[PDB]
């Protein structure tokens, strides 16, 4: 019965083998975020930036990378709640989809998609992007970029996300650091509109104290435990 909005971040995919910017040193795969996740960075050195996303995109599809029990629990939660569930993720991986979730809002885009730099049309894309790869949507073919929202760019699906933040009865943030905005501010919006807020994390987030209920530990243990608790509670 309750409307449940889940926000996930990089932590949920850590046990699956996917790393992210660890704000301790502000390095993602030992690259400064300035250089690999800004429009400037892509303007300055598109070869390096495309190579970086090519590496991430290849690594995501390696056999050792699999959804973990936290991802599966969120698919079970959607199964239980149907249209009264929405999953928003900051993650660019496809592990929620592999677990069985549908209608996932990727507010920062998707590593397995690219975008025409001219038209904005989005393409599924599982391989490398090379300079020879141009769009097929424009008369004058244009370069393709990762369909990944960079720092300084506007996230995707925000109107729907803000609508769900208001509508939610329960807002659960899973695996988020509390350092990336606007996502890190969602808990405030959820609280403003009356939701019960839950943090599930390995490490308490910067904004952890804003959450009403919280559980910490490995995601693969904590998230299934919480989903079980929630579904039991809902009857």
């Amino acid at each position: 019965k309750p409307r449940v909005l889940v926000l996930t971040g990089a932590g949920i995919s850590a046990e699956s083998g996917i790393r992210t910017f660890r704000a301790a040193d502000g390095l993602w795969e030992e690259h400064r975020v300035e250089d690999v996740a800004t429009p400037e960075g892509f303007d300055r050195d598109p070869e390096l930036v495309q190579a970086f996303y090519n590496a991430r995109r290849r690594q995501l599809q390696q056999p050792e990378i699999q959804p973990n029990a936290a991802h599966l629990a969120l698919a079970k939660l959607q199964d239980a709640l149907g249209d009264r569930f929405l999953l928003v993720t900051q993650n660019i991986d496809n592990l929620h989809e592999r677990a069985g979730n549908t209608n996932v809002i990727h507010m920062h885009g998707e590593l397995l998609k690219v975008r025409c730099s001219q038209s904005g049309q989005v393409l599924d894309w599982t391989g490398d992007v090379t300079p020879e790869d141009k769009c097929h949507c424009c008369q004058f073919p244009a370069p393709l970029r990762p369909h990944v929202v960079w720092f300084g760019e506007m996230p995707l699906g925000m109107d729907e996300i803000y609508m769900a933040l208001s509508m939610a009865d329960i807002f659960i943030a899973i695996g988020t650091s509390g350092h990336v905005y606007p996502a890190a501010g969602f808990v405030h919006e959820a609280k403003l509109h009356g939701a019960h807020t839950v943090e599930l994390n390995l490490e308490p987030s910067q904004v952890g104290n804003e959450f009403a209920e919280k559980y910490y530990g490995p995601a693969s243990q904590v998230v299934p435990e919480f989903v079980e608790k929630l579904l039991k509670g809902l009857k």
Binding site: H108, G152, E153, G178, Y181, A184, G185
Partner: peptide, 9 residues
């Protein structure tokens, strides 16, 4: 709403 993607600090 929300502004652009940005890191604290």
């Amino acid at each position: 709403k929300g502004g652009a993607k940005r890191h604290r600090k």
